[PDB]
Design a protein around this ligand. Structure first.
Ligand SMILES: [Ca+2]
Length: 279
């Protein structure tokens, strides 16, 4: 399948070259997979989600996304126009308040929630969790991410936006999950992207168009935007039967475009997420 005039990041993940604008993907499109977006929530009523998104948990007075961040990330995972995996089921878990903040205890509870809640859902092709969030190093936050992964969920987390080594941030520094840095449309490391040996992969993160609250759209930047490209790619590849939740991060790194990014510090992987879709 071909989506013309796609956002650059979608075109990038199905291309061996920067500078194109059509996204190519197998029509299965992540059908039968599930992706949990653990964030500020998701505006499930947005026409872009087509009834495939729902809120499953909140820790605040509402499950509504009063920020936009979670909606934007969920859009990059699975919206009809802005999404990588256009037929996946999206589940929102609101661990972040409408200011985009959340206590680590809440975030930990959200991760353990997903590890259990997947047993209440129909995801025959597999389960992914996208975590576009983080703060300073916490062994308890890393442990929660490690448990979620161990439970059979492909965990993708943002490297962070500090232009620093991700070893000092969580859940970015948990080795057993998939830690995602950000790139731009000219294949440069995004200016704010963290780096370091703990990164597994880069995805598109600078100037990413996606859904927003009030049934709107906008372009924003962050490792928060790179992460859902990878989460959606994993759901897409698991639907194709090419990989599993436990092995998808490794499979994505194995099949990545290699050595194409500029300003990658010595010792950080030079690997850009790629779906290797051949029509
Ligand atoms: Ca890892």
């Amino acid at each position: 399948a071909a989506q013309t005039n796609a956002p650059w990041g979608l075109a990038r993940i199905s291309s061996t070259s920067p500078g194109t604008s059509t996204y190519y993907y197998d029509e299965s499109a992540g059908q039968g997979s599930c992706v949990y977006v653990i964030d500020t929530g998701i505006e499930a009523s947005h026409p872009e989600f087509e009834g495939r998104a729902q809120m499953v948990k909140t820790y605040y007075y509402s499950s509504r996304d009063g920020n936009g961040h979670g909606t934007h990330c969920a859009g990059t995972v699975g919206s009809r126009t802005y999404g990588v995996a256009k037929k996946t089921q999206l589940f929102g878990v609101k661990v972040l308040d409408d200011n985009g903040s959340g206590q680590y205890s809440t975030i930990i509870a959200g991760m353990d929630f997903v590890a259990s809640d997947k047993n209440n859902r129909n995801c025959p092709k597999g389960v992914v969790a996208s975590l576009s969030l983080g703060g300073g190093y916490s062994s308890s936050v890393n442990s929660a991410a490690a448990r979620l992964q161990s439970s059979g969920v492909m965990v993708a987390v943002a490297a962070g936006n500090n232009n620093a080594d991700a070893r000092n941030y969580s859940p970015a520094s948990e080795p057993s999950v998939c830690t995602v840095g950000a790139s731009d449309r000219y294949d440069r490391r995004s200016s704010f992207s963290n780096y370091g040996s703990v990164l597994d992969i880069f995805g598109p993160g600078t100037d990413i168009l996606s859904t927003w609250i009030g049934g709107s759209t906008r372009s924003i930047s962050g490792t928060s935007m790179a992460t859902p490209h990878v989460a959606g790619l994993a759901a897409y590849l698991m639907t194709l039967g090419k990989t599993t939740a436990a092995s998808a991060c490794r499979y994505i790194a194995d099949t990545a475009n290699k050595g194409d990014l500029s300003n990658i510090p010595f010792g950080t992987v030079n690997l850009l997420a790629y779906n290797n879709y051949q029509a």
